[PDB]
Amino acid sequence: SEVVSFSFTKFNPNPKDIILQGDALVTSKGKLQLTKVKDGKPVDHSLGRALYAAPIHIWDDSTDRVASFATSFSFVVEAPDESKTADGIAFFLAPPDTQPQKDGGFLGLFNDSNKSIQTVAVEFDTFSNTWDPSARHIGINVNSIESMKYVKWGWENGKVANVYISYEASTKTLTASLTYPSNATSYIVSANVDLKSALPEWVRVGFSATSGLSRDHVETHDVLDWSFTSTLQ
Amino acid sequence: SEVVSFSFTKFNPNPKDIILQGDALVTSKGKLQLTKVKDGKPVDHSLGRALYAAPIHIWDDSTDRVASFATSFSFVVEAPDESKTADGIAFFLAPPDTQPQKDGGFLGLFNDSNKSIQTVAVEFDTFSNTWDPSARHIGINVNSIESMKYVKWGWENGKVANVYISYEASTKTLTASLTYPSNATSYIVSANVDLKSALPEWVRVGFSATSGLSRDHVETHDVLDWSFTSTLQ
Amino acid sequence: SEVVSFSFTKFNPNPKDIILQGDALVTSKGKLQLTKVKDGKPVDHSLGRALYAAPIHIWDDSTDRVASFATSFSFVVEAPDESKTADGIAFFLAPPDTQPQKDGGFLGLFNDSNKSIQTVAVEFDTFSNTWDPSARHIGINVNSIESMKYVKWGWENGKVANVYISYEASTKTLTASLTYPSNATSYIVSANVDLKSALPEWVRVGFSATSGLSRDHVETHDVLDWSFTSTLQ
Amino acid sequence: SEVVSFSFTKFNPNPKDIILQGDALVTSKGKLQLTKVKDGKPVDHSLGRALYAAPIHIWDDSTDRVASFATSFSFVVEAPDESKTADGIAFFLAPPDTQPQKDGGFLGLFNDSNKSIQTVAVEFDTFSNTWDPSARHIGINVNSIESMKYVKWGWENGKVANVYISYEASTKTLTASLTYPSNATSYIVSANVDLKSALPEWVRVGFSATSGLSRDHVETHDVLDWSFTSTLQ
Ligand SMILES: CC(=O)N[C@@H]1[C@@H](O)[C@@H](O)[C@@H](CO)O[C@@H]1O
Ligand SMILES: CC(=O)N[C@@H]1[C@@H](O)[C@@H](O)[C@@H](CO)O[C@@H]1O
Ligand SMILES: CC(=O)N[C@@H]1[C@@H](O)[C@@H](O)[C@@H](CO)O[C@@H]1O
Ligand SMILES: CC(=O)N[C@@H]1[C@@H](O)[C@@H](O)[C@@H](CO)O[C@@H]1O
Ligand SMILES: [Ca+2]
Ligand SMILES: [Ca+2]
Ligand SMILES: [Ca+2]
Ligand SMILES: [Ca+2]
Ligand SMILES: [Mn+2]
Ligand SMILES: [Mn+2]
Ligand SMILES: [Mn+2]
Ligand SMILES: [Mn+2]
């Protein structure tokens, strides 16, 4: 068997075991700032991703086994105007050499063309695109910006959101939950996801986020902490 | 600091680090059978509880600190008739010397009289009593059979339910979630619970369950696995 | 499988998941004081033991498997006079209902009569009895006060000793090591121990210590911290 | 704080979270073969290293803190002739971009010139060079092929050696132990090592090994398993 685990109470300003992509950076105070902020205000047309350094062995073709994993992180999405927000933040798995994809509604995870890339993600969508449901939502996405399953999400502006995500290999069940401690409000969505068929044997895990493509659709996407463990046997 | 953790993939037929109360027993196959089964059929007027041997330090008066904990267990509730079920199963914390309370709708956790006992529990209620909401539910209960918060629960007869419960001391947030891998269906409920004011410094953690008080309101309450960790600092 | 683990950075003055036996108590500062101290000076004819509350499943007759475990603790032995010391302190496993045995050189673990009790222990002996080697030693003991294997031990008066003990089930190897960080000095002893044949399926783990039987052979036996994990599969 | 941990019961033939350097490879059976083997026989002039993918934060200049870590691995060194062996294998820490250094007696870790590189290592030396003690030894090395402290090591040809290494930041104590389960024989060495002064803030951890520079001084250097955890607070 192979177990791999890591836990940050906060992030290090120059983090060597976190690959920073796009505009992602860690603040002096140890927040993982996924999207751009200038003069303490979020900027549009921004995209940032962060991956853990060590690839995670999620399945093995030789032994035909699949990994079960669990991760918990807290994040904040703040927007100067509650009514106009975009685009969102997501936890995702992708091939180790994964690079930022389309910005805006694609969340830096997906793009177009039949050549849709291997990426499984739990997204926290704050903007209803043409492929979305009408209200803000938490979606389970499998190789597409369109969620296979989702649950309506009462986003709370600027409030800390605690997230727990677990994948049970034995039942191919991916579950994702969000709780705002502020008002003890929760949401959850689960889906049957075959990882072997959606992703390669090894993957990198992390976060991706994008601010909106207009000045009036901006917000922050900061990750405050992160714990993650995966076991393959 | 003090960390305490334990993990059973299944239970041992004669388990010395599990205190069995009432009719609770572990089957040869390693299932924690909370309620009575005779000829493979659940019997009425049954009550069983199971606690971990070692008390858990959840708060300390001297250092004024509170513990954060997390537990995951999978359970099955099977009833010969879908329409008539009772009463339920619950994960709970109570003083170390805790003993079974009222049966039936009280879930072996609570009883009557102003002398209501110290017990915090996440309950999986399958019968609507006079103090319940109308439909089956997952409730957060604080020193009362009446839930402070609850979420409607689409109970699936005989199907495995995976549960994750976490308490974040820093925000006094208790969250409880249920997912049926069978059909990737989920439910979640969270509540602000001050543990210091509801329970003593040390507690025992475990499960409690009761079958209905009539022959036509019977079901099983089996726990298949259990992991639990708590840290106090 | 079944995993069980606990970690104290220090002890709680009134510890509910530590069974205190004999004169053992935890000080206000959180030290596990195994032997008696009066006016800050160790007293003779003292014996104290401490066990973790939850029994540990070390082997299972049905599945014919044995547990692998590992524990680390730091301890101090202080004596007003370097030349005259007694008797020692030990980490040990014994049946769950284990009670203090003979004092003095028997370390509160063993006694006489063909009815020698089931107890495996790693002892830190500070007095050469008739059954001991001549110099102070770390011994692996299997159902006898006489060590099966030992290594000469350069005891450092009043200095912190860090101990790591591990049992590898697959090779029936018990290893015990001591390091004084003060002067980076180390000692180690290992032995082939069949746990199934020496102890029952379930056991309690902990510490035992005794001061000498004369006024001029006194010392303290304090445990400062303790971590312990055991897995059975 | 930041915790990082990983555990392999064995290695994966194409391991993406293990950087393989020099001649190092993983066999079909999952052994980490550090040095070359041709027709099942070890070859001379060989050097192989393996590092974990994710850098480890061992100290932080801003917060002036140091990490405590612990690792356990089992390894085998087999030589066709007991009397003539070389050179050895070592666990080591070095800057993340670390590359193989001199072969032979330098163990792929060190080389010459005042420009001696930052590398701390626990070495299992099977050949007495001009800078070594006379007999085979386990050495603690700090930025030099010459060990600061060592203990004579009774190497057992072809037998499994279990190793436990721990660094206690609070006392700057590095301890390294070896036990042969075959005959319950142990060795240990500890040293006061200031990591902040010997290595940069971030490092990569892993193994390095070299076979001798002559045909009659050859042996294997295989790692069978590996667990490692480090916490910085
Ligand atoms: C395709 C795409 O990303 N569309 C974006 C949408 O996601 C949102 O950010 C909007 C804000 O004005 O700008 C565009 O419409
Ligand atoms: C107070 C109480 O437990 N009432 C019980 C209720 O919980 C349910 O089990 C019912 C089934 O016929 O029997 C009684 O009404
Ligand atoms: C049998 C026995 O415990 N003998 C004790 C010995 O252990 C030591 O404590 C000594 C000190 O004067 O007192 C007695 O001889
Ligand atoms: C400097 C150096 O590595 N010297 C090596 C020594 O380590 C050993 O391998 C020997 C075997 O014949 O070959 C050389 O002397
Ligand atoms: Ca969207
Ligand atoms: Ca009810
Ligand atoms: Ca003695
Ligand atoms: Ca050498
Ligand atoms: Mn979406
Ligand atoms: Mn209820
Ligand atoms: Mn002895
Ligand atoms: Mn050397």
CA-CA distance, C93 to C203, in Å (whole number)?
6
Q: Is B137 annotated as a binding residue?
A: yes
DSSP A35: S
Instruction: Please state, as a whole number, how many other Cβ atoms lie within 10 Å of the Cβ of residue B63.
Output: 10
Full residue range of the structural domain in which residue A148 is found: 1-233
**How many domains does chain B fold into?**
1
Q: Is there a cis peptide before residue B87, judged by omega within 30 degrees of 0?
A: yes
The end-to-end CA distance of chain B, in Å, is 5
CA distances from D222 to A32, C156, D85, D160, D211 (A): 40, 38, 15, 10, 12
CA-CA distance, D108 to D101, in Å (whole number)?
5
Measured from the CB, is residue A111 less than 6 Å from ligand 1? no
DSSP for A123-169, written as a single string: EEE-S--TTS-SS-EEEEEESSSS-SEEEE----TT--EEEEEEEEG
Contact flag B53-C56 (C-beta cutoff 8 Å) = no
Half-sphere exposure (Cβ direction) of C4: Cα atoms closer than 13 Å: 23
Using the Cβ of B227 and the Cβ atoms of chain A, whether some distance falls under 8 Å is answered with no
CA-CA distance, D189 to D178, in Å (whole number)?
9
Instruction: Please state, as a whole number, how many other Cβ atoms lie within 10 Å of the Cβ of residue B177.
Output: 27
- Give the bridge partners for C192, in sequence order: C173
Locate A208 and state its tokens: 């991706």
Measured from the CB, is residue A86 less than 6 Å from ligand 1? yes
Of D205, D207, D223, the C-alpha closest to D160 is: D223
Q: Between chain C and chain D, are at least 3 CB pairs below 8 A? A: yes
Of A90, A116, A66, A109, the C-alpha closest to A189 is: A90
Q: Is C129 annotated as a binding residue?
A: yes
Instruction: Please state, as a whole number, how many other Cβ atoms lie within 10 Å of the Cβ of residue B111.
Output: 14
Q: Is C132 annotated as a binding residue?
A: yes
Q: Is there a cis peptide before residue D225, judged by omega within 30 degrees of 0?
A: no
Measured from the CB, is residue D86 less than 6 Å from ligand 4? yes
Locate B142 and state its tokens: 């604080």
**Distance between Cα B128 and ligand 2 center (Å):** 9
CA distance A4 to chain D (A): 4
CA-CA distance, A214 to A202, in Å (whole number)?
36
Q: Which residues lie closer than 8 Å to A39 by C-beta, 6 or more apart? A: none
Using the Cβ of C143 and the Cβ atoms of chain D, whether some distance falls under 8 Å is answered with no
Measured from the CB, is residue C87 less than 6 Å from ligand 3? yes
Residue type, B90: A
Instruction: Please state, as a whole number, how many other Cβ atoms lie within 10 Å of the Cβ of residue A99.
Output: 11
- Considering only CB atoms, which chain C residues are within 8 Å of B224? none
**Distance between Cα A216 and ligand 5 center (Å):** 16
CA-CA distance, A138 to A149, in Å (whole number)?
9
DSSP C128: -
**Would you list which residues of A are annotated within the binding site?**
123, 125, 129, 132, 137
Q: Neighbouring chains of B at 3+ CB pairs within 8 Å?
A: A, C
Locate A121 and state its tokens: 């993600």
List, chain by chain if needed, residues with CB within 6 Å of any ligand 2 atom.
B 86-87, 104-105, 127, 129, 212-214, 217
CA-CA distance, C28 to C48, in Å (whole number)?
17
Using the Cβ of A52 and the Cβ atoms of chain D, whether some distance falls under 8 Å is answered with yes
Using the Cβ of D159 and the Cβ atoms of chain A, whether some distance falls under 8 Å is answered with no
CA distances from B217 to B48, B85, B140, B222 (A): 16, 5, 23, 17
Locate B65 and state its tokens: 């600190």
| Mode of pairing for the β-strands spanning D47-52 and D185-192 | unpaired
- Give the bridge partners for D41, in sequence order: D38
Locate B218 and state its tokens: 């019977």
Torsion of CA B139, B145, B148, B152, to 10 degrees: 30
3-state secondary structure of B36: coil
CA-CA distance, C204 to C76, in Å (whole number)?
23
CA-CA distance, C158 to C166, in Å (whole number)?
25
Residue type, D212: G
CA-CA distance, D92 to B219, in Å (whole number)?
58
Phi and psi at residue C218, to the nearest 5°? -120, 155
Tokens 């009432």, residue located: B22
Locate B115 and state its tokens: 């002398």
Q: Which residues lie closer than 8 Å to C123 by C-beta, 6 or more apart? A: C88, C89, C90, C107, C109, C138, C139, C141, C147
**Distance between Cα C50 and ligand 7 center (Å):** 19
Rg over alpha carbons for chain B, rounded to the nearest Å, is 16
Locate D42 and state its tokens: 């070890």
| Mode of pairing for the β-strands spanning D18-22 and D47-52 | antiparallel
| Chain centroid, CA C232 distance in Å | 22
CA distances from B103 to A220, B83, B144, B213, C211 (A): 51, 21, 14, 8, 52
For residue C128, the ligand closest to its alpha carbon is 7
CA-CA distance, C157 to C136, in Å (whole number)?
12
CA-CA distance, C86 to C97, in Å (whole number)?
27
User: Is A121:A90 a contact under the CB 8 Å cutoff?
Assistant: yes
User: Is A43:A75 a contact under the CB 8 Å cutoff?
Assistant: no
CA-CA distance, C79 to C37, in Å (whole number)?
11
Tokens 């046997």, residue located: A233
| Mode of pairing for the β-strands spanning D226-232 and D68-76 | antiparallel
Q: Which residues lie closer than 8 Å to B74 by C-beta, 6 or more apart? A: B160, B161, B162, B163, B223, B224, B225
CA-CA distance, D77 to D210, in Å (whole number)?
11
Q: Which residues lie closer than 8 Å to C218 by C-beta, 6 or more apart? A: C41, C42, C43, C44, C79, C80, C86, C211, C212
CA-CA distance, B156 to B160, in Å (whole number)?
8
Tokens 């600092």, residue located: B233
Burial readout B138-166 (b: 16 or more C-beta within 10 A, e: otherwise):
bbbbbbebebbbbbebebbeeebbbbbbb
Locate B162 and state its tokens: 């995976």
Of A120, A124, A117, A161, the C-alpha closest to A139 is: A124
CA-CA distance, C154 to B225, in Å (whole number)?
47
Locate A69 and state its tokens: 């994993």
Phi and psi at residue D77, to the nearest 5°? -120, 110
**Would you list which residues of A are annotated within the binding site for Ca(2+)?**
125, 129, 132
Please give the interface size between B and C, counted as residue pairs whose CB atoms are below 8 Å apart. 67
User: Is A48:A21 a contact under the CB 8 Å cutoff?
Assistant: yes
* Shortest CA distance from D148: residue in chain C: C184
CA-CA distance, C182 to C204, in Å (whole number)?
32
| Chain centroid, CA B209 distance in Å | 7
Question: What is the dihedral sign for C-alpha A175, B209, B103, B54?
Answer: negative
User: Is B20:B50 a contact under the CB 8 Å cutoff?
Assistant: yes
- Give the bridge partners for C165, in sequence order: C71, C176
Give the nearest partner residue to B9 out of C1, C7, C60, using CB atoms.
C1
Mutate to test the pocket of ligand 1, among A46, A87, A216 (most ligand atoms within 8 A of CB): A87
CA-CA distance, B174 to B150, in Å (whole number)?
12
**Distance between Cα A104 and ligand 1 center (Å):** 5
Using the Cβ of C166 and the Cβ atoms of chain D, whether some distance falls under 8 Å is answered with yes
Locate C11 and state its tokens: 């002890």
Locate D34 and state its tokens: 């550090």
The phi-psi region of residue A132 (left if phi > 0; otherwise alpha if psi is between -120 and 50; otherwise beta) is beta
User: Is A1:A232 a contact under the CB 8 Å cutoff?
Assistant: yes
Q: Is there a cis peptide before residue A125, judged by omega within 30 degrees of 0?
A: no
CATH number for the domain harbouring residue A214: 2.60.120.200
Residue type, C209: A
DSSP for chain D, written as a single string: -EEEEEEESS--SS-TTEEEEET-EE-TTS-EE-S-EETTEE-SS-EEEEEESS-EE-EETTTTEE-EEEEEEEEE---SSTTS--EEEEEEEE-TT------GGGTTT---SS-----EEEEEE-S--TTS-SS-EEEEEESSSS-SEEEE----TT--EEEEEEEEGGGTEEEEEEEEGGGTEEEEEEEE--HHHHS-SEEEEEEEEEE-SSTTS----EE--EEEEEEE-
Interface of A with D in 109-138 (CB under 8 A): none
Q: Which residues lie closer than 8 Å to C102 by C-beta, 6 or more apart? A: C108, C110, C111, C112
Burial readout B210-230 (b: 16 or more C-beta within 10 A, e: otherwise):
bbbbeeebbbbbbbbbbebbb
Q: Neighbouring chains of C at 3+ CB pairs within 8 Å?
A: B, D
Residue type, D141: N
DSSP for C51-102, written as a single string: EESS-EE-EETTTTEE-EEEEEEEEE---SSTTS--EEEEEEEE-TT-----
Task: Write down the number of H helices and E strands in chain C.
Answer: 1, 21
Burial readout A110-132 (b: 16 or more C-beta within 10 A, e: otherwise):
beeeeeeeebbbbbbbbbebeeb
H or E, element range at B12: none
Measured from the CB, is residue D212 less than 6 Å from ligand 4? yes
- Considering only CB atoms, which chain A residues are within 8 Å of B187? 188
Phi and psi at residue B104, to the nearest 5°? 60, -130
Phi and psi at residue B170, to the nearest 5°? -55, -30
Of C74, C65, C110, C79, the C-alpha closest to C92 is: C110
Report the residue count for chain D. 233
CA distances from C186 to B220, D121, D177 (A): 56, 18, 9
CA-CA distance, C131 to C104, in Å (whole number)?
13
DSSP for B59-126, written as a single string: EETTTTEE-EEEEEEEEE---SSTTS--EEEEEEEE-TT------GGGTTT---SS-----EEEEEE-
* Ligand 3 nearest atom to the CA of residue C103, by list position: 3
Phi and psi at residue D198, to the nearest 5°? -100, -25
Mutate to test the pocket of ligand 2, among B83, B84, B101, B127 (most ligand atoms within 8 A of CB): B127
DSSP A82: T
Of D207, D225, D230, D232, the C-alpha closest to D7 is: D225
Q: Is B97 annotated as a binding residue?
A: no
**Distance between Cα A122 and ligand 11 center (Å):** 59
Q: By alpha-carbon position, which residue is closest to atom 9 of ligand 1?
A: A212
Locate C158 and state its tokens: 């009043």
User: Is D135:D153 a contact under the CB 8 Å cutoff?
Assistant: yes
CA distance B186 to chain A (A): 6
CA-CA distance, D169 to A185, in Å (whole number)?
41
Half-sphere exposure (Cβ direction) of C41: Cα atoms closer than 13 Å: 7
Contact flag A177-B184 (C-beta cutoff 8 Å) = no
Instruction: Please state, as a whole number, how many other Cβ atoms lie within 10 Å of the Cβ of residue B135.
Output: 12
User: Is A128:A105 a contact under the CB 8 Å cutoff?
Assistant: no
User: Is A86:A211 a contact under the CB 8 Å cutoff?
Assistant: yes
Measured from the CB, is residue A143 less than 6 Å from ligand 1? no
The angle subtended at Cα B21 by Cα B17 and Cα B24, nearest 5°, is 90
User: Is C136:C126 a contact under the CB 8 Å cutoff?
Assistant: yes
| Chain centroid, CA C77 distance in Å | 13
Q: Is there a cis peptide before residue C87, judged by omega within 30 degrees of 0?
A: yes
For residue C218, the ligand closest to its alpha carbon is 3
- Give the bridge partners for D47, in sequence order: D210
Locate C34 and state its tokens: 């195994």
Tokens 């999620």, residue located: A58
Residue type, B140: I
- Considering only CB atoms, which chain B residues are within 8 Å of A175? 162, 164, 177, 179, 186
Mutate to test the pocket of ligand 4, among D35, D111, D213 (most ligand atoms within 8 A of CB): D213
Measured from the CB, is residue C105 less than 6 Å from ligand 3? yes
